[PDB]
Write a protein that binds this ligand. Structure first.
Ligand SMILES: COc1ccc(OC)c(CCC(=O)Nc2cc(-c3c(-c4ccc(F)cc4)nc(/N=N/c4ccc(F)cc4)n3C)ccn2)c1
Ligand SMILES: CCCCCCCCO[C@@H]1O[C@H](CO)[C@@H](O)[C@H](O)[C@H]1O
Ligand SMILES: CCCCCCCCO[C@@H]1O[C@H](CO)[C@@H](O)[C@H](O)[C@H]1O
Ligand SMILES: CCCCCCCCO[C@@H]1O[C@H](CO)[C@@H](O)[C@H](O)[C@H]1O
Length: 336
């Protein structure tokens, strides 16, 4: 029902509702392309993404559905959310293009830090928001699995949002991800938070590995070689035999590694950067840690509605994924 207009951008004809004005390209790639625009109806600067080849194949179609389902479900201040989704198509029969709209973002966490130490109050505020968003994401039984500064948008008021992309590196990955362990815990993301927090406090990458093996080597130097209780949980014969032939290394004294840091920050890092993922602090537990006393509000750290991910196991035809995607476009309700 909106009146659309057509304009050539990023070498295709974009067709968008007239509320979105002054489109200008900001990025592109195999996924599609993104324009900045001004949403006259809300007064917001927005990013409009036109998906590329959304229904070219079964895998493309399922990926399009997955992305729209995820963005429609995420409704939290510290997670990317969907302002709008539209298609110029008037029916399923002519449905070929998908456009997604969110807040225009212009800076990530790297841009805020610039290889400098942040003040402790500033670190508390940033890590607090990451953990608040992760509590929400994990409560939907979602694991990010590649959390890193480039996936963290931050505006001029230092308001932070978790993204599942970077704005137009393995240094933050949990060691079990590096080792193709599978059976991943949600605390793989807590490992990443610990790496980010350490860098914010010191102004230096915690584990700047040159390659995969070097990354693991640096990790074991800080946290020590696996202990007896962790070794009991390793089913891989080859992993055990390699680990048992390592020269033992104690866990370093984090208080001496992070000299000059808030001792409550050091305590929290010790609970995030644990090799055994079962012994890592959760996002909800971390929010209650004394380090965040000035920001923690147990009544404003919400959890997500249940997220039905059963579609992940299904093998459907292109036109079925396409019709399911069309249903999700039609049923979209814009946020307050
Ligand atoms: C670093 O400092 C900067 C300084 C100046 C700048 O300007 C030139 C910029 C760029 C501004 C910008 O890019 N802003 C922006 C982008 C997106 C967005 C969406 C997006 C998502 C959902 C929507 F509803 C709408 C857009 N998708 C995306 N990429 N997707 C990908 C990516 C990689 C993959 F491998 C796969 C997919 N991006 C980058 C969202 C919001 N703001 C940065
Ligand atoms: C200067 C450019 C302004 C673009 C405003 C786009 C508003 C898009 O929205 C339109 O606004 C009209 C205003 O009379 C309404 O009557 C239409 O129903 C509405 O769809
Ligand atoms: C809504 C954005 C925050 C939650 C993101 C959950 C992502 C679940 O899937 C994630 O998709 C990301 C994009 O493909 C990938 O970077 C991650 O590796 C993948 O695990
Ligand atoms: C030499 C490098 C050793 C890395 C050990 C990483 C141990 C991570 O921890 C393991 O994560 C698994 C899920 O991924 C869980 O099933 C295990 O119970 C847990 O111990």
């Amino acid at each position: 029902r909106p009146t659309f207009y057509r304009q050539e951008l990023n070498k295709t004809i974009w067709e968008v509702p007239e509320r979105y004005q002054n489109l200008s390209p900001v990025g592109s790639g195999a996924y599609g392309s993104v324009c900045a625009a001004f949403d006259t109806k809300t007064g917001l600067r927005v990013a409009v993404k036109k998906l590329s080849r959304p229904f070219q194949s079964i895998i493309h179609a399922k990926r399009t559905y997955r992305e729209l389902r995820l963005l429609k479900h995420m409704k939290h201040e510290n997670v990317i959310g969907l302002l709008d989704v539209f298609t110029p198509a008037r029916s399923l029969e002519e449905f070929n293009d998908v456009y997604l709209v969110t807040h225009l973002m212009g800076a990530d966490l790297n841009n805020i830090v610039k290889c400098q130490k942040l003040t402790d109050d500033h670190v508390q505020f940033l890590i607090y928001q990451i953990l608040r968003g992760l509590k929400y994401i994990h409560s939907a039984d979602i694991i990010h699995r590649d959390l890193k500064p480039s996936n963290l948008a931050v505006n001029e008021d230092c308001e932070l949002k978790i993204l599942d992309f970077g704005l137009a590196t393995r240094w933050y990955r949990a060691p079990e991800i590096m080792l193709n362990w599978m059976h991943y815990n949600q605390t793989v993301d807590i490992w990443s938070v610990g790496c980010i927090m350490a860098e914010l406090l010191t102004g230096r990458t915690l584990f700047p590995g040159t390659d995969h093996i070097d990354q693991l080597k640096l990790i074991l130097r800080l946290v020590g070689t696996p202990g007896a209780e962790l070794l009991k949980k390793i089913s891989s014969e080859s992993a055990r035999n390699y680990i048992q032939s390592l020269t033992q290394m104690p866990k370093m004294n984090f208080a001496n590694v992070f000299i000059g840091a808030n001792p409550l920050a050091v305590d929290l890092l010790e609970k995030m950067l644990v090799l055994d993922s079962d012994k890592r602090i959760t996002a909800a537990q971390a929010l209650a840690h004394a380090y965040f006393a000035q920001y923690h509000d147990p009544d404003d750290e919400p959890v997500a509605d249940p997220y039905d991910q059963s579609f992940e196991s299904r093998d459907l035809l292109i036109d079925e994924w396409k019709s399911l995607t069309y249903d999700e476009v039609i049923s979209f309700v814009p946020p307050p």
